[PDB]
């Protein structure tokens, strides 16, 4: 038989029953498809920083542990 085609009735209170949830808004976002030749260079920057920090820490550890 003929059926009710459509209605948005009660949909808003259904939505608000568990509230309108907001996005989590994390601090960091994946850089997978973003600005190549920039984030690759950023990887190089981080590697250089880590290498310098690690070599300095290793020097300190060796000179303090004899």
């Amino acid at each position: 038989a003929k059926s009710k085609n459509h209605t948005n009735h009660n949909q808003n209170r259904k939505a608000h029953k568990n509230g309108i949830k907001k996005p989590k808004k994390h601090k960091f976002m994946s850089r997978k498809g973003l600005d190549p030749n920039f984030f690759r260079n950023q990887k190089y920057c981080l590697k250089g920083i880590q290498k310098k920090k690690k070599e300095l820490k290793l020097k300190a550890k060796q000179e303090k542990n004899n």
Binding site: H16, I20, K21, P23, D35
Partner: protein
Amino acid sequence: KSRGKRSGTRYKFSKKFRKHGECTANKYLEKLNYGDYVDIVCDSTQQKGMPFNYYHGKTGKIFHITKRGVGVLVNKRVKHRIEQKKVCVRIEHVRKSRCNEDFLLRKIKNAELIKEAKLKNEHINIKRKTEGPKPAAMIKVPPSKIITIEPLPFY
């Protein structure tokens, strides 16, 4: 039955009266940085990079910048939850948002006020005032302009 990309955008995506033509050359000179707020206003003269109908007039943060495009994070309401959407548009359809310009001006002004307040060790209220009830005023007025009002008859 008809739900094309630009369905229902007859007036929204039309140029204003006597405001037709391509964008000014100065629009291409505006500076965009990652994470700053931006307004998505569709410019119908540029067809590529055109945002979808929903995002015209919305605001979002930059998450990606390309040579002639920009990716902006916009919250869109989908029934029971808000969800983030990454819309990619050309720089003709995007504009530096002023949603936080009052915030930045307040930041700099309050900084240079607090500096001198701490210098003089004076405790100052820095928050905005939401001013409400006015004080009593002992106001003078000569009787040459206290005019009496009566409801008017019908004509």
